[PDB]
Ligand binder design. Structure first.
Ligand code: 1U5
Length: 358
């Protein structure tokens, strides 16, 4: 590898691993459009299995970027519109608070206070209907952003209804397969179990538990190679031959709402480049990222801006991930770890690396 990349990656990641006690880690840097890979430590401590370029990590909420793009693809196919009422695709949602809540609101956490988590007691489909029917908004639609699995998760499930495909089938056929993400899974197959890292929480080996709308909100697993390819695909979507998938990528990086210095896309979040590192680092802390904040509508949405810092944090009980890229520079990074360690540490490391390479 170029020594500049080797040196800034190792100078940044070595102390991070030490400070955070991360058992295993994979990093991809995309520099001038090409990937460079780095791995450390253990996928499975007990079985002494090292992290490799083939190791699967739980992406947690980085999964929302796949959901957002799959939704964008469905819009491009003419199957849904973001201006459609939620009830167009779920007619049984008859409670009056749903009047005026559109797919846009669900996709962008602006429906009026849908909760961060779907309650664990929601198992069946009828449980899910009851939950949404009984939910009471704190705010009018399109006025406050509150990051929520129950919001974008419902968007993903509704976005695929006109296709007749399951969410998983739609994601496989329409996103994973055309992009050759052949080691990226909503459900890890038996053939791939040998590569599935354990997560570590309080020293115990853990994997994500089943939950309602899990695939849509936090349920993808992938390797550092496929995640580097996901970044490449979102860095330069014009190179994508499938017209609707190209368009869906563009739609997911369009700017729909602004709060502070950040813009909400579909799954992706964006800031103008050059960014203030304090903004992305401090902003990534859950004290801000999960807080209820007023939003300004961007009417109409701004098309995807090439000079952007485009990014997403995500975690599960045992994993912590981050992806960031700057389309204008063909520059990006993926950081996958099998410990959930604080967001600002991820973003600080990513900025030190990308800032040095810019
Ligand atoms: C969004 C979260 C905080 C997390 C994340 O940090 O991505 C971890 C639990 C959670 C509700 C979820 O589903 O993912």
């Amino acid at each position: 590898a170029p020594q500049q990349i080797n040196d800034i990656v190792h100078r940044t990641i070595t102390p991070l691993i030490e400070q955070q006690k991360i058992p295993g880690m994979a990093v991809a840097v995309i520099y001038q459009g090409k990937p460079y890979y780095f791995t450390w430590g253990y996928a499975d401590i007990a079985k002494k299995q090292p992290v490799t370029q083939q190791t699967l990590f739980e992406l947690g909420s980085v999964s929302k970027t796949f959901t957002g793009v799959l939704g964008g693809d469905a819009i491009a196919r003419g199957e849904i519109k973001l201006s459609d009422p939620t009830t167009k695709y779920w007619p049984e949602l008859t409670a009056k608070q749903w009047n005026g809540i559109t797919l846009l609101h669900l996709a962008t956490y602006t429906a009026g206070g849908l909760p961060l988590q779907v309650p664990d007691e929601v198992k069946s489909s009828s449980d899910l209907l009851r939950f949404y029917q009984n939910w009471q908004p704190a705010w009018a639609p399109g006025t406050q952003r509150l990051y929520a699995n129950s919001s974008i998760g419902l968007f993903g499930a509704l976005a695929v209804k006109p296709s007749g495909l399951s969410f998983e089938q739609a994601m496989q056929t329409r996103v994973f397969q055309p992009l050759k993400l052949n080691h990226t899974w909503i459900n890890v197959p038996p053939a791939e179990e040998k590569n599935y890292a354990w997560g570590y929480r309080e020293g115990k080996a853990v994997h994500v538990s089943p939950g309602a709308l899990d695939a849509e909100a936090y349920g993808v697993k992938s390797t550092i190679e496929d995640m580097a390819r996901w970044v490449q695909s979102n860095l330069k979507p014009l190179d994508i031959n499938e017209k609707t998938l190209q368009q869906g990528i563009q739609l997911a990086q369009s700017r729909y709402w602004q709060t502070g210095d950040m813009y909400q896309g579909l799954g992706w979040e964006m800031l103008d480049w050059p960014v203030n590192p304090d903004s992305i680092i401090n902003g990534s802390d859950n004290k801000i990222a999960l807080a209820a904040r007023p939003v300004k509508a961007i009417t109409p949405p701004t098309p995807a801006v090439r000079a952007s810092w485009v990014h997403k944090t995500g975690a599960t009980g045992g994993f912590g991930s981050y992806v960031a890229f700057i389309p204008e520079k063909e520059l990006g990074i993926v950081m996958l770890a099998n410990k959930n360690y604080p967001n600002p540490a991820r973003v600080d490391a990513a900025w030190q690396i990308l800032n040095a390479l810019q």
